[PDB]
């Protein structure tokens, strides 16, 4: 229940343990006025600030005027902030607005075609997001919903999309989440305690080109559709081989352990441990941070199921491209589709009370 | 940590309300009575282990490399975390197996009403089964598996996943609010009144259809809210609307939630006035709903409401004159019934020998 500070270097959510549900929203920008835009900003920083502490946004949800819809929606009255994380970031999209084409990073890379890519344009892009994060759901829809509220006539929201339940790990202390495969998902990511890790591979620096950018992060967000029917048919063995890891403990394949290290050459050449590991990708590593979800049924008899895969990096020209270049000839590829994708560069953490989501930029 | 499974009644009505809701509506395929049979007695085979927290048949792994897992492996590490299953059938499923002299009278079609824009994909069913748990992996797991089992038999119509409190963070005794920012539960038959669920809730033999004693009837409506126009709403109107205070939820002109209202100083089309037993002729329902979120329309609209689920001894007696007195409900302007089924939920399974539908099918 309790509250992860908001103030920072870097944004929380990120490095942060990986909280129960998550609530993404995609946003586009509806105002020409450079200025009006910063004090949504603004604005917004000061409701993030309260929403995080588990307060309501402006004078409350109840005891003002008879006559005036409240400041904040109510629906949270009474909870905790529950681990409650707000991330903003910047899509490409944003930075041909308000002159600031010359700020875009050259690590805010466009991704090329993927094979097997199915994208949806209308869930895909975004010129700016807001990752929430928290264990209770009610919080996080209250959250990008008041958001929302305070955003009307200068931004709409493109697309969302509720987690149900994570599938990552910052933490390798506590127990290993699972995706709908079966498989434990997040043992080998980079853990919140690793600050040397996280300066070589999430955290932008100053030297690499982009000053604003200096303690942000490049996220990349895609929607993969899992082909549970198929899966489901699918022998144990075929399981296993498809990752290189055993389904119920979670080790490699041959040895005893969860994190037990990987022995890449007793794997399958198509496993996708074995192409997404960084020992195959020049020592490119990533933070994952996905989400499962499920969006009813496919309207033909089966429940639909899928991953929403998130990855924070310092680069993503050296994080999400290489490695998903590389699982071009992945097994797992005929169990999945990328239906949705979308970049972002999250900007530094907001230092202190009187600082602003994107004040080094704008 | 568990709730029994077995019961004269199914579990699921009135033990205690866990924090989430994974429902799924199913269609029958076969037409063979026998292959039904032995699916409800594999079912419920299966309702055994997963409601005490152990995978399906065989296992999640560790059998025939060459075969299919037995269960899909999404829970394995989880706990209970109070797992219900509770069935119920259609008035569809009378029309197969010779069973549609066995419908029960108490299962009544519903009337069409003001406002209504059902869904028909959404709406209807041969089958449910309502998977309430703490953690929502645990609820999704079983209807996962639960439908692979059936498949070739049935297939799953709809799916709609709820949230209500997380009680890891939120007092037993608080109210839950909904997505309105209102205490959604105070004037409720809880599980704890013996008399009035024998009353109100639970079909008897000498009400006409001796299959179903100890079962109940089930209506399921899903209600979109329109969020962003109840949000622009002033505070007096919402608390108009209803007939409570925002803050406190009390009875207007009272000073605590738990007063008993005073009808005659509601505004005359306010939703607790017009949905109260002594508006209704004494009639008195079992609410045990779930909000949802689902994600943003095509608009840019929050996809959010209530996923409404009563339980009554009789749906002429229940759902249906307590609705039909919400024709000029102030609520109206803010809610739009879109999807909607009734399911007659069977008797509890008594013991280990028993199934699912035995006293249905002998
Ligand atoms: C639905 C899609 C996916 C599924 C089910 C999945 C499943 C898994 C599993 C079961 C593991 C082993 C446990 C672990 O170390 O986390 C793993 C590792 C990994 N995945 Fe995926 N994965 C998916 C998509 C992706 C994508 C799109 C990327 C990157 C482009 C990726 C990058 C990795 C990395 C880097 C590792 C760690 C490898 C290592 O260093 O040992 N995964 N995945
Ligand atoms: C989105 C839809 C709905 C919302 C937001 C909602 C909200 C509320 C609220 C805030 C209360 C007051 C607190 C309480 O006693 O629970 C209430 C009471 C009640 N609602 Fe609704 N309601 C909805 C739909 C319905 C429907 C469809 C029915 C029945 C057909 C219904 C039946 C009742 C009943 C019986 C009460 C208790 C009245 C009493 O005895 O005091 N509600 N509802």
């Excluded at 103030?7 to 343990?17: D, F, L």
């Excluded at 994060?133 to 009307?152: E, K, M, S, T, Y």
């Excluded at 043992?187 to 600050?195: C, L, V, W």
């Excluded at 942000?216 to 290189?244: C, K, N, P």
């Amino acid at each position: 229940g309790s509250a992860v500070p908001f103030h920072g270097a870097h944004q929380a959510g990120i490095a942060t343990p990986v909280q129960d549900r998550l609530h993404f929203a995609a946003f586009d920008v509806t105002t020409e006025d450079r200025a009006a835009f910063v004090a949504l900003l603004k604005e917004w920083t000061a409701a993030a600030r309260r929403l995080t502490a588990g307060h309501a946004v402006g004078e409350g949800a109840y005891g003002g005027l008879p006559e005036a819809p409240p400041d904040d929606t109510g629906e949270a009255l009474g909870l905790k902030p529950s681990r409650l994380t707000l991330t903003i970031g910047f899509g490409p999209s944003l930075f041909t607005r308000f002159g600031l084409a010359d700020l875009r990073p050259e690590a805010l890379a466009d991704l090329p075609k993927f094979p097997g890519d199915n994208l949806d344009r209308a869930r895909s892009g975004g010129d700016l997001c807001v990752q929430a994060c928290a264990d209770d759901p009610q919080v996080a829809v209250h959250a990008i919903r008041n958001l929302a509220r305070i955003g009307f006539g200068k931004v709409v929201v493109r697309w969302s999309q509720l987690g149900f339940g994570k599938t990552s790990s910052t933490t390798p202390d506590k127990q290993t989440p699972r995706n709908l495969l079966g498989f434990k998902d997040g043992t080998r990511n980079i853990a919140g305690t690793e600050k040397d890790r996280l300066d070589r591979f999430v955290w932008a620096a100053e030297k690499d080109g982009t000053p604003w950018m200096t303690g942000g992060s490049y996220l990349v967000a895609r929607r993969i559709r899992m082909h549970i029917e198929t899966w489901d048919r699918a022998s144990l063995q075929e399981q296993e081989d498809v990752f290189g890891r055993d389904k119920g403990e979670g080790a490699p394949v041959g040895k005893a352990k969860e994190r037990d290290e990987p022995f890449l050459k007793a794997m399958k050449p198509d496993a996708h441990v074995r192409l997404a590991h960084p020992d195959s990708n020049g020592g490119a590593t990533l933070l994952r941070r996905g989400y499962s979800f499920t969006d009813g049924t496919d309207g033909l008899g089966r429940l639909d199921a899928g991953l929403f895969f998130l990855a924070y990096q310092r680069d993503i020209r050296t994080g999400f491209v290489p490695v998903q270049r590389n699982l071009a000839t992945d097994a797992l590829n005929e169990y999945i589709q990328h239906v949705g994708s979308a970049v972002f560069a999250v900007p530094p953490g907001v230092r202190d009370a009187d600082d602003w989501w994107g004040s080094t930029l704008f």
